[PDB]
Every structure is written in C-alpha cells, then in structure tokens.
Design a protein around this nucleic acid. Structure first.
Length: 363
RNA sequence: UGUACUAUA
C-alpha cells in the first residue's frame, strides 16, 4: 500500500482496492482531502462504472460508495443510479447493500434520481410481495424508512399499494419492524393516504386490536384528529359488544384506555365538530354502562382494572348530556368503593380508594 | 399490578 502511494493516480486498481478492507479505508481517507479529491474520484468513477452493483453489495466496497456519495457530481451520481435502480430489492435486502442505498437516498440531488429509485421500486422491477418483504426485513425496513423521510409523499405509491393489497396489513402491522415502518409512513402521509390505509386497518381491526404490535397502530390512529368523524364510529360499531373482553387482554387494554381518554379530551375540550362531540358523548355513556355492568370482573381483572381506573379518573373529566353523566358515573363509583375490601390484598386496592375519594371532593 | 424501537469494516 505504501508503494501504491508512490504510484501516480492514473495507474491504480480501484476495484481491487475497494474490495479490500485496508485498500478501501485507504481510498476513503483520500476523498477526505481537498488536495487529491477531484482527481481521485474522476479516475475512481471511470474505473467503476460497470461495477456499481458489485461495489454496493461488496462487504468492503459499500463503504466506498457511501463515502463517494458525499463527493459525487449530480451528473455522476445520476449515472450510478441509472445503473442500479432495477436492483433496489436485492440491494436493500442485502447485509452490505442496504447501507449503500440509504446513503444514496439521503444524498439525492434532484427529482430524476428520486424518480429512478422510485421507478426501481415499482412493479415494473419490484413486486408487491417483495415490497412487503422489504418492509419487514432487518435490512430492508431501514431503506423504506429513508424513502419515507427523504421523499415527498407523492412518491409513496409503491409502499401504499403493498399495504392496502389484500391482508398484508396483518403481515406488516403484526411484525416487529413493519409496525415501526407503518407509523413512520403515517407520520408524514397526506390526509388521503392516511384515510386509504385507515380503511384497511378498520377492515382487519379484530386482528390488529390485540396484537403485541398491531395495538400500537390503532392507538396511533386515535391521535390523528382528522379521523374523528370516521374512526370513532367504526371502532365502537365493531368492538362495543366485547369491550369487557377487550379491556382484560394485555394489549387491547391499552387501546381501550387510549380510547376512553380520547372521548374525555374531546368532550372536555368543547367546554371539534358538534356531531363528533355529540357522538363521543353517546359512546362514552355507552362505555360507562358496560363497565358498570362488568364491575365485579374488571376491578378483579389483572388488566381490566387499569381500564377501569382510567374511566374513573376525575383528573380526566374534572370540567364535568352532562346530567346523565353524573348518574352513570355516580352509580359506577358509588358501588365501586363498595368493593374495595373485596380486593384488600391487591396492589391497586388503595389506588382506587384515592380515586373515589377524589370524586367525592370534586362533587 | 400491564406491551414493541432494529442492521455491514
């Protein structure tokens, strides 16, 4: 390597170097110098044109591509992407290739480069089942997320299609990495894109409602205000009959709890559309009803009690149709504190005692 | 008394 330093830049084997760890670490540190920078890449770039794909997937070549991304001309980077865009799948799913593609995305210079990458993710080159596979893959999901954060939501077509296709909403949402990807997508999606996916989520709701990851998807939606006129009715018109069961499961409890708190925030906040507010008021009383009925179960239940304490939490509904609320709540609380000795040993025995004591001093 | 955050020298 010391002798290569002596050799003029014209006569270096950049592929042989880049394939080598120490040989690659050498080439990087050269790019990190204004003296010997333009001369380096312009000879590197010329020698590697037919080998971009190789370098991207090479256990040591990828570090050079990433490094070269910070010094490439738009004219030169556009040509790299023109060469490897059909291969974005096998690149993204690769242990070494995922890193290269993320840097290319994070360093795009124009619409043309972006479109090419998008073009390679289209069904012309990459299938739906493969997109789904990328979303859930340990190396692939990092590439999708970069697309999600770097690209305008108008390019999200290939991702959206893979989600709304059949029952894939279970494949993605009920999966470690895929659950995180979907939330990232929904965090920057357009209003239309949120609705298009939200419909599908509603369709397969019973499978997402108590999944160890899917439940985070429902709660995520419950924070989007622009969904109140639709999601609020749909959850209740699909889950109200088993609300007792839903409150006594490890994951669904948290969605019910998130749900109850949303009804409070909307109603108290008014003191949002009147219909939404109105509909929230009927559901809440209907919510309270079921809990009053199943008190002798929910308060003794390992997960149910948490949902119960949330419904009773005066802090949530202190500013409090309002006539019937106090009767439903009163009846609920007035025979709840009648059950404290029935769970004397329990951890949360004295937790509710301070709650019923907080309702008396607010009424 | 109760749930997730990742992968190349």
């Amino acid at each position: 390597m010391v002798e290569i330093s002596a050799l003029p830049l014209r006569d270096l084997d950049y592929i042989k170097l880049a394939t080598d760890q120490f040989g690659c670490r050498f080439l990087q540190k050269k790019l990190e110098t204004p003296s010997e920078s333009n001369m380096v890449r312009d000879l590197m770039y010329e020698q590697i044109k037919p080998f971009f794909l190789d370098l991207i997937l090479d256990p040591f070549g990828n570090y050079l591509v990433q490094k070269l991304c910070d010094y490439l001309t738009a004219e030169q980077k556009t040509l790299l992407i023109q060469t490897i865009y059909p291969n974005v799948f096998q690149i993204s799913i690769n242990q070494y290739g995922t890193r290269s593609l993320q840097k290319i995305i994070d360093t795009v210079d124009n619409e043309v480069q972006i479109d090419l990458i998008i073009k390679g993710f289209s069904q012309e080159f990459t299938s739906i089942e493969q997109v789904v596979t990328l979303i859930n893959d340990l190396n692939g999901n990092h590439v999708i997320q970069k697309c999600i954060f770097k690209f305008s939501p108008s390019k999200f077509g290939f991702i959206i299609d893979a989600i709304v296709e059949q029952n894939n909403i279970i494949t993605i949402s009920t999966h470690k990495h895929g659950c995180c990807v979907l939330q990232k997508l929904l965090s920057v999606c357009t209003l239309q894109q949120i609705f298009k996916i939200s419909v599908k989520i509603v369709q397969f709701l019973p499978g997402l409602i108590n999944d160890q990851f899917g439940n985070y998807i429902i709660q995520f939606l419950l924070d989007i205000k622009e969904l109140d006129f639709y999601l609020l009715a749909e959850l209740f018109n699909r889950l109200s009959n088993e609300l007792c069961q839903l409150s006594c499961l490890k994951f669904s409890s948290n969605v019910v709890e998130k749900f109850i708190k949303k009804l409070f925030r909307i109603i108290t906040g008014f003191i949002a559309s009147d219909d939404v507010i109105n509909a929230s008021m009927n559901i809440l009383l209907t919510t309270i009803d079921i809990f009053t009925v199943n008190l002798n179960v929910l308060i003794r239940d390992n997960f149910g009690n948490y949902a119960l304490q949330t419904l009773l939490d005066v802090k949530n509904y202190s500013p409090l149709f309002c006539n019937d609320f106090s009767l439903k709540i009163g009846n609920l609380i007035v025979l709840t504190k009648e059950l404290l000795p029935s769970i004397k040993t329990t951890s949360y025995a004295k937790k509710i005692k301070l709650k019923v004591k907080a309702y008396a001093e607010a009424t």
